[PDB]
């Protein structure tokens, strides 16, 4: 009931809206509204056929998938969505020229690994257009979460003609994108603080889309957000720190468990030279010197809780006995000032220095600045002779500097792309596109490269955390909001792109 226009906020400028290249939660959420793959997560968090017209035929050994495509699916320029669009985009994803950070997900597809490494041509990838509306996908091995990959933006189709025509400007703004999802993107210049979703009249399932328009603006402090919410300019707003705590008893307060882990990254090599974090004792000193409980109680105050695992609690469970991965792994790198100070003294002796300066990178929101000041406080008071310089940059700049290894240490986070520990653990394999720390442990790589698979993944976390201190988990993220009661059917996805607005609607007045 009433006008079906939804007004939302986002905490950062869009880093990428290229469905192949995007690897961040902001951009992946955008392309999830505007484009669509073979599957998409349903209301219960299960991948369901979307671009696929029916349930695939699957071989006995579960490696060959024969998939019929919707014959009524169209691009926003009227071109039909065909098998060729999937072949093109999956080859694009593995093509070394593209340097797509998620190219490693295509290890699941026959020859994907070899193509990323330049050992085979992209045309050898295990996807074939049998005809214009039929795919044959050949996996490298049985992959239980394959349908979750099919629901992930890197596996969405692309219109080769359009992508080619736009060249290096492809997806740099909303005029340089094509849409096959519930919404079209409008009003995005590439670098501005507003953008718009408009119901796509050429979407095959448009009769289920109820919102005519979704307006998004960048807001980076809860006070501004709250004022906009109270003056009815936005319908949902993020609350952090005291703003969460002051509104936690409000009728419209809601908490979202993101099953995401925020962690400290320790870059071991910058501009070709070892940093101080090449020393394990120094990594351990920083890691163990942060009161994680106080952090969440002081900085977040939003349902977030301390993390002593990379893999979040409550997310993934043993196929044998159904017990949580985190219970089997146990805690790692628990807050301990004395053990931190022991590591600090030993590290400083090994390096032959009395003092160290390092720069801590985080984002440029009000709460990220509070976070950084808290961590600076913790490390400086606990570790004599340590100076921590603060860098607080736009999310996209942090990510660029991460890819370039142009940082010392940083606050980073990962949300799962499918429901298995590997979504987290695979990040820190040697030379991985999401490693970017020059962290390399061959035993860790060997583990990650069925009950046996699970048991080994449990063991891997001990190597990463307790043994090597590659990173330091800080918290398991929840997010607090005020949310107007008239928003109905707001689908929060348990993994992959964060939201699906497709069937969201409003019961205003």
């Amino acid at each position: 009931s009433g006008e079906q226009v939804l007004n939302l906020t986002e905490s950062a400028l869009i880093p990428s809206a290229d469905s192949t290249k995007a690897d961040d939660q902001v951009g992946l959420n955008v392309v999830n509204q505007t484009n669509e793959g073979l599957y998409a997560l349903d209301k219960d968090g299960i991948p369901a056929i979307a671009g696929a017209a029916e349930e695939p035929k699957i071989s006995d050994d579960k490696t060959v998938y024969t998939i019929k495509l919707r014959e009524d699916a169209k691009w926003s320029n009227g071109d039909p969505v065909t098998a060729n669009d999937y072949v093109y985009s999956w080859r694009r994803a593995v093509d070394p020229n593209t340097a797509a950070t998620y190219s490693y997900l295509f290890d699941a597809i026959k020859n994907g690994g070899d193509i990323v490494a330049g050992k085979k041509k992209p045309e050898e990838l295990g996807i074939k257009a049998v005809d214009d509306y039929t795919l044959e996908v050949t996996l490298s091995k049985p992959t239980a979460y394959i349908n979750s990959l099919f629901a992930f933006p890197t596996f969405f189709p692309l219109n080769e003609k359009f992508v080619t025509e736009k060249g290096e400007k492809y997806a740099q703004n909303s005029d340089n994108m094509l849409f096959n999802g519930p919404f079209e993107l409008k009003d995005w210049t590439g670098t501005n603080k507003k953008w718009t979703y408009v119901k796509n009249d050429k979407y095959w399932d448009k009769d289920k889309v109820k919102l005519k328009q979704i307006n998004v603006q960048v807001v980076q402090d809860s006070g501004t957000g709250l004022n906009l919410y109270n003056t009815d300019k936005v319908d949902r707003t993020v609350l952090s720190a005291d703003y969460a705590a002051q509104n936690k008893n409000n009728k419209d307060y809601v908490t979202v468990n993101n099953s995401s882990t925020f962690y400290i990254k320790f870059n071991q090599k910058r501009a070709g030279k070892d940093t101080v974090f090449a020393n394990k004792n120094i990594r351990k000193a920083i890691a163990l010197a942060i009161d994680k409980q106080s952090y969440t109680d002081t900085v977040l105050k939003n349902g977030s809780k301390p993390a002593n695992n990379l893999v979040p609690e409550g997310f993934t469970f043993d196929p044998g006995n159904k017990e949580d991965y985190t219970k089997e792994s146990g805690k790692h790198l628990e807050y301990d000032v004395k053990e931190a100070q022991k590591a600090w003294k030993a590290g400083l002796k090994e390096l032959g220095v009395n003092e160290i300066t390092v720069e801590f990178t985080s984002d440029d929101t009000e709460n990220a600045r509070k976070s950084s000041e808290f961590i600076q406080d913790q490390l400086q008071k606990n570790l004599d002779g340590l100076t921590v310089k603060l860098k607080n940059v736009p999310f996209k700049v942090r990510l660029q500097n991460d890819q370039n290894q142009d940082y010392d240490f940083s606050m980073s986070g990962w949300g799962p792309d499918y429901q298995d520990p590997s979504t987290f653990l695979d990040l820190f394999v040697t030379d991985g596109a999401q490693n970017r720390m020059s962290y390399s442990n061959k035993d860790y790589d060997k583990i990650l490269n069925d009950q046996k698979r699970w048991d080994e993944m449990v063991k891997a976390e001990k190597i990463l955390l307790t043994d090597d201190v590659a990173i330091q988990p800080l918290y398991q993220r929840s997010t607090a909001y005020l949310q107007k009661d008239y928003i109905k059917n707001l689908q929060k996805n348990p993994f992959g792109p964060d939201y699906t607005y497709k069937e969201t609607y409003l019961t205003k007045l």
Binding site: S11, A12, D23, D24, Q25, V26, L28, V238, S240, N258, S260, F262, S362, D363, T365, N367, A368, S371, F395, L399, D402, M411, S412, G413, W414, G415, D417, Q434, R477, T479, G496, P497
Partner: peptide, 6 residues
């Protein structure tokens, strides 16, 4: 997916 600190 890489997470932003709100």
């Amino acid at each position: 997916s890489d997470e932003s600190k709100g």
